[PDB]
Amino acid sequence: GYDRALSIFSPDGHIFQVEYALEAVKRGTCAVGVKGKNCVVLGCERRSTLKLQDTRITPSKVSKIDSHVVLSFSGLNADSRILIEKARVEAQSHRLTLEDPVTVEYLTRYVAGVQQRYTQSGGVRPFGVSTLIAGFDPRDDEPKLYQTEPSGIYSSWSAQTIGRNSKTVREFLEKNYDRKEPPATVEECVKLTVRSLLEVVQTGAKNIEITVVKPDSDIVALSSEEINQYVTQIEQEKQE
Amino acid sequence: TTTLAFRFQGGIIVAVDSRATAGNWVASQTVKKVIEINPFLLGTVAGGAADCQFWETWLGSQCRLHELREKERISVAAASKILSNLVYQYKGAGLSMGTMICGYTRKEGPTIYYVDSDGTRLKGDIFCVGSGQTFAYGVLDSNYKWDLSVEDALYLGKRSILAAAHRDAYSGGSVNLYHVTEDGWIYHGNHDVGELFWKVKEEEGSFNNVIG
Amino acid sequence: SDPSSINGGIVVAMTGKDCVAIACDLRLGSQSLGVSNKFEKIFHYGHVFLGITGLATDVTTLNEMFRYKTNLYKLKEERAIEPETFTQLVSSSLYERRFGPYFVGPVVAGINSKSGKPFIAGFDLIGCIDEAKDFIVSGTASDQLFGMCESLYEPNLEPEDLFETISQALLNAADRDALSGWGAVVYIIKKDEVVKRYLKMRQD
Amino acid sequence: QFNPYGDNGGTILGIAGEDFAVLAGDTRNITDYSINSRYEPKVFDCGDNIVMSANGFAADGDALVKRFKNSVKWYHFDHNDKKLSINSAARNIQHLLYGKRFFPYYVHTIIAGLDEDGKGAVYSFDPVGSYEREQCRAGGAAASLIMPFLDNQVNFKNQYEPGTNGKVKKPLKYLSVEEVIKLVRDSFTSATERHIQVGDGLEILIVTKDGVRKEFYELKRD
Amino acid sequence: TQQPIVTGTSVISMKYDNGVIIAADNLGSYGSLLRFNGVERLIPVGDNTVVGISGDISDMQHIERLLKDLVTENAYDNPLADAEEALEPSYIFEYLATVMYQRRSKMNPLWNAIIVAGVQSNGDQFLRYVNLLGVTYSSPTLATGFGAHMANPLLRKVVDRESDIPKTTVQVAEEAIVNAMRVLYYRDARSSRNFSLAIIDKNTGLTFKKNLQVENMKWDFAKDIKGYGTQKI
Amino acid sequence: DRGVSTFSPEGRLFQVEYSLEAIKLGSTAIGIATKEGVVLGVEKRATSPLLESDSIEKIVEIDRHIGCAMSGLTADARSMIEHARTAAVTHNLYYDEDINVESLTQSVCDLALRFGELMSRPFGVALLIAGHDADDGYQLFHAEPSGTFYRYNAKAIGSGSEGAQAELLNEWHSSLTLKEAELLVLKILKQVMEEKLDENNAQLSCITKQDGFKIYDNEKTAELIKELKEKEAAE
Amino acid sequence: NNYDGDTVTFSPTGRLFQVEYALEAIKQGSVTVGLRSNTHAVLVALKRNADELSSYQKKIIKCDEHMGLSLAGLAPDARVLSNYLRQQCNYSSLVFNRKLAVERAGHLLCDKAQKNTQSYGGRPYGVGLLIIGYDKSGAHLLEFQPSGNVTELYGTAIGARSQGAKTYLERTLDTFIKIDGNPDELIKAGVEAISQSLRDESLTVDNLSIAIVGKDTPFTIYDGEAVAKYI
Amino acid sequence: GSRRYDSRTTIFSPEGRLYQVEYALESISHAGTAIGIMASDGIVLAAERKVTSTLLEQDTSTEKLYKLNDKIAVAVAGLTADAEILINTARIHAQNYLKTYNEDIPVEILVRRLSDIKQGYTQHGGLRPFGVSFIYAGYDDRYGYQLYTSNPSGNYTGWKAISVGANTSAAQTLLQMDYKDDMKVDDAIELALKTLSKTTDSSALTYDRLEFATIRKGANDGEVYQKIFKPQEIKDILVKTGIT
Amino acid sequence: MDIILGIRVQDSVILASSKAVTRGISVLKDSDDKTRQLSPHTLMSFAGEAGDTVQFAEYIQANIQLYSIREDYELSPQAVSSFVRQELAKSIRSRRPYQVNVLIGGYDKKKNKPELYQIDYLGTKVELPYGAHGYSGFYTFSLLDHHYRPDMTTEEGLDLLKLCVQELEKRMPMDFKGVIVKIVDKDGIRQVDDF
Numbered sequence A: 001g002y003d004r005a006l007s008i009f010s011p012d013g014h015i016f017q018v019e020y021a022l023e024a025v026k027r028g029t030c031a032v033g034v035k036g037k038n039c040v041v042l043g044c045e046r047r048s049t050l051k052l053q054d055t056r057i058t059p060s061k062v063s064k065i066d067s068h069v070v071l072s073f074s075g076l077n078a079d080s081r082i083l084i085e086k087a088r089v090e091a092q093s094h095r096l097t098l099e100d101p102v103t104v105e106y107l108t109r110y111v112a113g114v115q116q117r118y119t120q121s122g123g124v125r126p127f128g129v130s131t132l133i134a135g136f137d138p139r140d141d142e143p144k145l146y147q148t149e150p151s152g153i154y155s156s157w158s159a160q161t162i163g164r165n166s167k168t169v170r171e172f173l174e175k176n177y178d179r180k181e182p183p184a185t186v187e188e189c190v191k192l193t194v195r196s197l198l199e200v201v202q203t204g205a206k207n208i209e210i211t212v213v214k215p216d217s218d219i220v221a222l223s224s225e226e227i228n229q230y231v232t233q234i235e236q237e238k239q240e
Numbered sequence B: 001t002t003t004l005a006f007r008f009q010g011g012i013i014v015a016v017d018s019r020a021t022a023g024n025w026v027a028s029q030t031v032k033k034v035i036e037i038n039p040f041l042l043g044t045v046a047g048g049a050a051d052c053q054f055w056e057t058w059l060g061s062q063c064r065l066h067e068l069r070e071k072e073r074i075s076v077a078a079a080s081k082i083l084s085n086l087v088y089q090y091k092g093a094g095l096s097m098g099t100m101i102c103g104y105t106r107k108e109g110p111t112i113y114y115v116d117s118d119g120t121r122l123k124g125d126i127f128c129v130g131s132g133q134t135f136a137y138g139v140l141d142s143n144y145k146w147d148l149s150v151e152d153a154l155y156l157g158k159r160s161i162l163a164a165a166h167r168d169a170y171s172g173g174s175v176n177l178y179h180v181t182e183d184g185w186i187y188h189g190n191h192d193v194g195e196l197f198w199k200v201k202e203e204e205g206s207f208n209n210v211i212g
Numbered sequence C: 001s002d003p004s005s006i007n008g009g010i011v012v013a014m015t016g017k018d019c020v021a022i023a024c025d026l027r028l029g030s031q032s033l034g035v036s037n038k039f040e041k042i043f044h045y046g047h048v049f050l051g052i053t054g055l056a057t058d059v060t061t062l063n064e065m066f067r068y069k070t071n072l073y074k075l076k077e078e079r080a081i082e083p084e085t086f087t088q089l090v091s092s093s094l095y096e097r098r099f100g101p102y103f104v105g106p107v108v109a110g111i112n113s114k115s116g117k118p119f120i121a122g123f124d125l126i127g128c129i130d131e132a133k134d135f136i137v138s139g140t141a142s143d144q145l146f147g148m149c150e151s152l153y154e155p156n157l158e159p160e161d162l163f164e165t166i167s168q169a170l171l172n173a174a175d176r177d178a179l180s181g182w183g184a185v186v187y188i189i190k191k192d193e194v195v196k197r198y199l200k201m202r203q204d
Numbered sequence D: 001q002f003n004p005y006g007d008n009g010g011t012i013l014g015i016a017g018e019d020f021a022v023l024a025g026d027t028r029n030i031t032d033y034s035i036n037s038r039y040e041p042k043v044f045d046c047g048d049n050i051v052m053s054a055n056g057f058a059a060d061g062d063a064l065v066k067r068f069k070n071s072v073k074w075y076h077f078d079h080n081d082k083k084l085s086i087n088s089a090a091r092n093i094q095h096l097l098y099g100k101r102f103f104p105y106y107v108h109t110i111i112a113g114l115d116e117d118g119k120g121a122v123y124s125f126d127p128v129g130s131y132e133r134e135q136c137r138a139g140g141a142a143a144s145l146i147m148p149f150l151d152n153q154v155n156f157k158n159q160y161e162p163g164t165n166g167k168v169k170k171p172l173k174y175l176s177v178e179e180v181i182k183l184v185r186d187s188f189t190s191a192t193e194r195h196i197q198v199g200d201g202l203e204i205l206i207v208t209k210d211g212v213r214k215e216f217y218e219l220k221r222d
Numbered sequence E: 001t002q003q004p005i006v007t008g009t010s011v012i013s014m015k016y017d018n019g020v021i022i023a024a025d026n027l028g029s030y031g032s033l034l035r036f037n038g039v040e041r042l043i044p045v046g047d048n049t050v051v052g053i054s055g056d057i058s059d060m061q062h063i064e065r066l067l068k069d070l071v072t073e074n075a076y077d078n079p080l081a082d083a084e085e086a087l088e089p090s091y092i093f094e095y096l097a098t099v100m101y102q103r104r105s106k107m108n109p110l111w112n113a114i115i116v117a118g119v120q121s122n123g124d125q126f127l128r129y130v131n132l133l134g135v136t137y138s139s140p141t142l143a144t145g146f147g148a149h150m151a152n153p154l155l156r157k158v159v160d161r162e163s164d165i166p167k168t169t170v171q172v173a174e175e176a177i178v179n180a181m182r183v184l185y186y187r188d189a190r191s192s193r194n195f196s197l198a199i200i201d202k203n204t205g206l207t208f209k210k211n212l213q214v215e216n217m218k219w220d221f222a223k224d225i226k227g228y229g230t231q232k233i
Numbered sequence F: 001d002r003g004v005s006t007f008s009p010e011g012r013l014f015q016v017e018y019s020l021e022a023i024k025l026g027s028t029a030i031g032i033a034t035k036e037g038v039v040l041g042v043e044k045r046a047t048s049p050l051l052e053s054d055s056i057e058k059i060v061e062i063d064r065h066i067g068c069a070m071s072g073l074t075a076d077a078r079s080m081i082e083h084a085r086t087a088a089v090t091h092n093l094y095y096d097e098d099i100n101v102e103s104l105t106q107s108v109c110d111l112a113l114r115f116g117e118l119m120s121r122p123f124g125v126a127l128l129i130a131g132h133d134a135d136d137g138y139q140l141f142h143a144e145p146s147g148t149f150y151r152y153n154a155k156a157i158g159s160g161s162e163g164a165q166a167e168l169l170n171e172w173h174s175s176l177t178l179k180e181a182e183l184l185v186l187k188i189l190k191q192v193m194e195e196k197l198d199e200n201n202a203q204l205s206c207i208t209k210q211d212g213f214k215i216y217d218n219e220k221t222a223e224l225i226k227e228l229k230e231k232e233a234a235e
Numbered sequence G: 001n002n003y004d005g006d007t008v009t010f011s012p013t014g015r016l017f018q019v020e021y022a023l024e025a026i027k028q029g030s031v032t033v034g035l036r037s038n039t040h041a042v043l044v045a046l047k048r049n050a051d052e053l054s055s056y057q058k059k060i061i062k063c064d065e066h067m068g069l070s071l072a073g074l075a076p077d078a079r080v081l082s083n084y085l086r087q088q089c090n091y092s093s094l095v096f097n098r099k100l101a102v103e104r105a106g107h108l109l110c111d112k113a114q115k116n117t118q119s120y121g122g123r124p125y126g127v128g129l130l131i132i133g134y135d136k137s138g139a140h141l142l143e144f145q146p147s148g149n150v151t152e153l154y155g156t157a158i159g160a161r162s163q164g165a166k167t168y169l170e171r172t173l174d175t176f177i178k179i180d181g182n183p184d185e186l187i188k189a190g191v192e193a194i195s196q197s198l199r200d201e202s203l204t205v206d207n208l209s210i211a212i213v214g215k216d217t218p219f220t221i222y223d224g225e226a227v228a229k230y231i
Numbered sequence H: 001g002s003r004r005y006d007s008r009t010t011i012f013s014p015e016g017r018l019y020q021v022e023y024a025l026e027s028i029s030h031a032g033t034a035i036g037i038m039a040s041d042g043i044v045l046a047a048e049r050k051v052t053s054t055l056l057e058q059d060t061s062t063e064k065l066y067k068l069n070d071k072i073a074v075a076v077a078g079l080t081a082d083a084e085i086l087i088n089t090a091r092i093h094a095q096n097y098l099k100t101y102n103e104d105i106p107v108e109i110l111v112r113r114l115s116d117i118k119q120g121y122t123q124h125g126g127l128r129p130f131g132v133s134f135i136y137a138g139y140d141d142r143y144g145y146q147l148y149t150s151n152p153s154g155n156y157t158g159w160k161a162i163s164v165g166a167n168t169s170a171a172q173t174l175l176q177m178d179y180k181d182d183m184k185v186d187d188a189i190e191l192a193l194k195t196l197s198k199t200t201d202s203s204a205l206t207y208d209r210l211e212f213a214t215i216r217k218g219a220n221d222g223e224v225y226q227k228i229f230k231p232q233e234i235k236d237i238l239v240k241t242g243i244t
Numbered sequence I: 001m002d003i004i005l006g007i008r009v010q011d012s013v014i015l016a017s018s019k020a021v022t023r024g025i026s027v028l029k030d031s032d033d034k035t036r037q038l039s040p041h042t043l044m045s046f047a048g049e050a051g052d053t054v055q056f057a058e059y060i061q062a063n064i065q066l067y068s069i070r071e072d073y074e075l076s077p078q079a080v081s082s083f084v085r086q087e088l089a090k091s092i093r094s095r096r097p098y099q100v101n102v103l104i105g106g107y108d109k110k111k112n113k114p115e116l117y118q119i120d121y122l123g124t125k126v127e128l129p130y131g132a133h134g135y136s137g138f139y140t141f142s143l144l145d146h147h148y149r150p151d152m153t154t155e156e157g158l159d160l161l162k163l164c165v166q167e168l169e170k171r172m173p174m175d176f177k178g179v180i181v182k183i184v185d186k187d188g189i190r191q192v193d194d195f
């Protein structure tokens, strides 16, 4: 088989292939994750360079791994499908052997493990993908939000963004998100998520996707009109 | 062999005999038929002694690796299923196992899983396994209640092994008692059947057929 | 115990003047127990018809397999498979399981779309082709069918006469076999029309 | 048909004292009604103050002892010349035996030595690796002749104190190394009289904190 | 798993004060047919070891080649191949014993019983047994097949225990072996009159005697034996 | 390009030397061994204030008697930890005993040089393996990606390593108590850390014979930080 | 230059640079001395520490009851080669009931190191070994190079500044070879030899590492206060 | 050794792009233009054969439009030989699905499968990617009529109208200008041909330079019919729409 | 295990399955649920050799659940039954076959129809109005043949099912400790807790 060591150390101690994978993530459309008191919201950017698209059938940016966990991403779209597939299989495998669905941390740790494996395996390149994994542990009402990246490191976040212009929206979240008192309701959490995307998105039409996840396998994706109402309310308050 | 385990208000009682035979020959009277998987989980041995010893000891290693990785006590459901999935891979090869995986966790409460070398895996409230199981079942079924005290439940498990020990030719030697709580199992001693029988006969008035 | 006679059932095929006919009973059982009276044993892939007797799981499996293969054939060849070609495919497919065979008794029937020639064929469980002019029989009442067909059959029967012959051959054979019956179907096949008739028979 | 197993006879006996342990075994090796050897050592010093015997089919017995001795050697290499404790040796032997679960070593294995507290220890194994610490264990051909005698004379079973009449058991007083060796010798003398596969010679290995000592005694050669 | 086809019968051997004696007849039977009369079943390895083999002859020939190959291999990169690092009886035996047990463990045995007789570097007598099962044992007298039943009893009357070995001379030991071979010829239906005998002495070295014959046989009494009970004529 | 397992003209493996540069970029981890126990402490170094710092796991349990701290490309350590845990548990299964800290460390270090063209590159992470056994008592090891491991009385790895090691040079003596060691790790971490040391961006742990390996609570560590400040202001 | 990218490439002058670079790693390693008489064989090794807090890297490894070596260079490679020797010593004992000849042990090491120099992908071993042993032909001392070259010697030294000890042994050749039935005096000569390779630093109690094997002496390593006698 | 000659097909650029995928996309940009237009009552596939000859046997030729099953078809842009390898793999997957579930494969599942195969070649194996871009036209009872596209990266997306191959920038603008949601097949046929007629590098658009196909529910009652247009039929529709 | 019945009525599928679990000489359990929910509107009951039954059922369950997540769509009962049949048909020629017989009761939300599929361990699939496995059919089919109508209500189906169970309890030698009854309809799966 093909055994070539593509990911290797350089004199300055860097693994360029892993770092160039991050550059692929930087190119990807922006994704944002914000956890409230009793919910998590995953916002995603849809670049409006592609019109005449069929939004019914086009792969959605947020993906269900199980009935209680979701995964969004920034970076290479084709690469993301491989991680999503592996995660979905591991979710059913865990239920089958442990007789209990995966915790969000466990699922994150698995996906991050896969990504890591590809950074020191022969004949493979790293995933050009960073993921935001969100949900609620079984029989638990505490919100969970994790991030992963091509290198294989993962960590928990009160709020986080990835993708193009993620520096800007992270800047926004760092000043607007309060740890002592997070978004108490679904409305507040979604609003803050939409607001953060409006710093970068351009137009608030079909460019913003919102998915709300709540405890006990309660996941729902907002429609265009529902999101458009948030976009309208934000800018009307801004005119002052 | 006679092994039993039953759920009750105060957790789980596990009781086993101590006899090991090779045909009519009594190889040992001091055999341990409760495998201490870890400080919270117990397993009974019936059928193949090696198969139960080896694979439940192994199960303990898996339970340890689980709680190191997951930073959390393994569930009795998960622990039992690791064993049942293992033996199922070996199905046909000739493993001989009849065991109760017993434990007490927060999410489950007191739980007993009967696991079998045929791959059977059953959750239940009362289980008896071995050549003297039918004798133990009789005493259990007639006297069992959920609201038993820890003292009475321990006696019921002891008395049920004694019933089997007496009638079943391949059961006896001594009775080992365990009480499983949420904070772990508690060993309640070894009880010679020879001394226990006369003690029970006199105090209880049972076994009138036997001359003492 | 014997796989070819657990489920039971029969197929018969005959040739006529510019036509072929293929027929089967509808019984599926577990030895003595009758399980289904709607288990059809005749399938078709384009204009080529395939009857399969024997172990019912294999009857199902092989139908799914020949559907699979004839569909890929059609995509690549850009035309529907012919009876003569399909017969060879069935033979090849069975023989590749030489030392672990499907327990079946297939029967091909159809008309060549180019030459218009009526064609029938039969196979053993291992792929040996029986290409008879007159008729092909298969199933748990194959002996009975051989007896019926040998006496009732005459060559160059018209479609509506052939129907009567093959129907009576099947019905009376199935009535002398415990594991066959519970209904029957007869296909009358002409070059560009096919008529399918369900027969009325005793229900035991 | 080829039968890979055979019976080489012989009988072994392990007894755990208070601060010592003995592992004895006759030196006769047989097939069917013929004597192969009148002196073929069966109990072995395996190092780290552990003695071992794998009685039954001699080829599997020798293979297992060889593999265990090898395990002791590689335990020293891999773990900085650490002493293998008798309990660790016992668990290691279980894995050797169970490793051939579906083509077993046709032997009844016994090891003897001292535990980590300095007390006498004996471990007994079945052919497929189920094991247990025991005070007293005879193995092999004449095991059924020896064990009842040991139950009576070592553990004082069925013996009661005169005058009380079945009310007070005889107290379980500790036996010295000299007292154990007497019971071992009388067990084998009795086994030699009534079992045809037992005889020729008796070899005893005594384990103490000072080391491993050997004692040999003649048995009847008929 | 096989069955033996062409077979060789008893191999007998014993220790004496300065070394070991080993003997085995020159017959390769084919069931009840006494097919091959010129089969050498004692195979010397160097000048200090003789391997006696009974049982299947095709497997014997295979073992014979392994030992021949062992000597070649020992000589590779070995300046002391004919001195300090020469093959010992104990090395040769342990090798065969390993092979025999490995083969039985794969359920494909070398269908043999083998006796390795020799003298070690330090002058010690070596005599040990191994068979198709990989079972091994040592004794002052060793024999395979019928030899075990008839030869051993006679040889054990000379050397009954370890202390009798220094008391036994080579002439006494050889006499006992030769007598045992005669007894086996009387009583073993798969034996022959012709045999080979080898002596490995620590002083005089390896003495290999071929084409020996059983002699001084008692048959004359047969003339007097008539019928099976009542018959007088 | 060039081989992965190539020697330089000086006689060093390029890839191993380069992985050591990656470890220098990693966050600081300090270990101090005493006769009352071994202390392990790490810099968490959160990349942003929105990152929940308690999810940063740079101190890890291998067995009840062995702990482990890491520094460098921490993702690489997960398979090393997994192997270590398996080795510790497997040895207990085979031998019914705890495994020696050195033997565990040796088992981890055997993976290190299993790279070529096995894995495609060396590990980009150094480990401080601390533990206790009956034979050699309290021990602290430094496991590198070269496959070499040194035992230490005290050791610092990461970005502030050479500065911290010089500080550990002066401060360490053979009669240190556990409490003295805890403060000493906190003192040296505070010195080499960019951000100001508190209970959220730094973590402590220890291994004792009685209680085994324990990661310290943020509340427990906070008290030790407050105790440190006062004793430094005391003179 | 252009011919040092891998071990499979000869230079125009017929050199294997990767092997020569592996040889260079030995020179960087700490000094170790080997010497023998007719009865005994001795290994003396100067252990190296990372700093004052660190332990002193172990240099000597036991292969069997009658054989063992001292290393200089990449320690992990010595672990691989020593492990291989342990197996070969153990194979000989188990299968042939025979202790492995020291000369034959050298042949095996040579052949193992050779395969790494001729194949693509791999690399030469980056360590030198000094094997001592006592077998059926008396005492022995070998010097292993990762080029594959193994050499039987009366005495030698490898590592940094090893030339000083090697010259001393060359002068003392006629003296130390005669030290028969006296292990202490043979070790003294080894400790005096390794002292010629020292600069600045001197032989302390946890610095020095000595091993010995002989006629009635199994391979035993001496460290700590056991070697204080010889300082 | 061999390392010296390795192009390393599956690596990132410093900017975070996959060299070979980007260069394969450049290759595809020189291929004949293929257009897919989805209407409410069917889908249209139109494609331009690249600089043909007068001696080319057109009626038996097939370089652009291929049939995966009775419900799903594809338009190809790039290396024809590469496309056929993938097409046969897709045909098999559809049949495997049908054998397993006894139902026709949903369009997206098939598209995902092929797109995952393409992806694999970019991440592992050290082989060059497939120099092919597909337009998938198909129907199933879940989502109805669907248009997709996949490219050598393994990334796929859904469309109402889309082009691949040469002059996609010009083509996509023309489609975005004249497309409407309530459009019908006969109108889509006209748009597809009008778009190719303007974006073509040839002097004039003729029947011999075209491949054409329609997936209609215009089949007798509730079922779907694929129509691969014959040379004479393409000539008729060119006159009907008023291009020739 | 022993007895598993199935009956498709007008607007639902009813599966009855015994509660007993016997091990040679003793009845170890009298409350065993021999069924698994494959999807919200598809239920599979099972009977056969010990271990194999549950191992198979859970393996199928996991696979259908995986498909539900991947496509965000529930497979039709027909599709699920075809998948299950293939697994058993694959299994019969394996080294060690699954010794499991199943009934798949589902409600097709697209067609708005209840569907009952009977599949044995050989991979012999049949769609039926009412079905059984093992000896259960021998006692019950004569009653079902007589009384069954395709336009029966759920309450009428349960009454006919009680008559079948009563006949089993009378003429079967084995004590199967009664049955657990479940109903599959447009609203999903629910258990009849009193029977």
Ligand SMILES: [Mg+2]
Pocket: D221, D222
């Ligand atoms: Mg006798």
Ligand SMILES: [Mg+2]
Pocket: C035, I118, I119, I120, I124, I125, I126
């Ligand atoms: Mg069926």
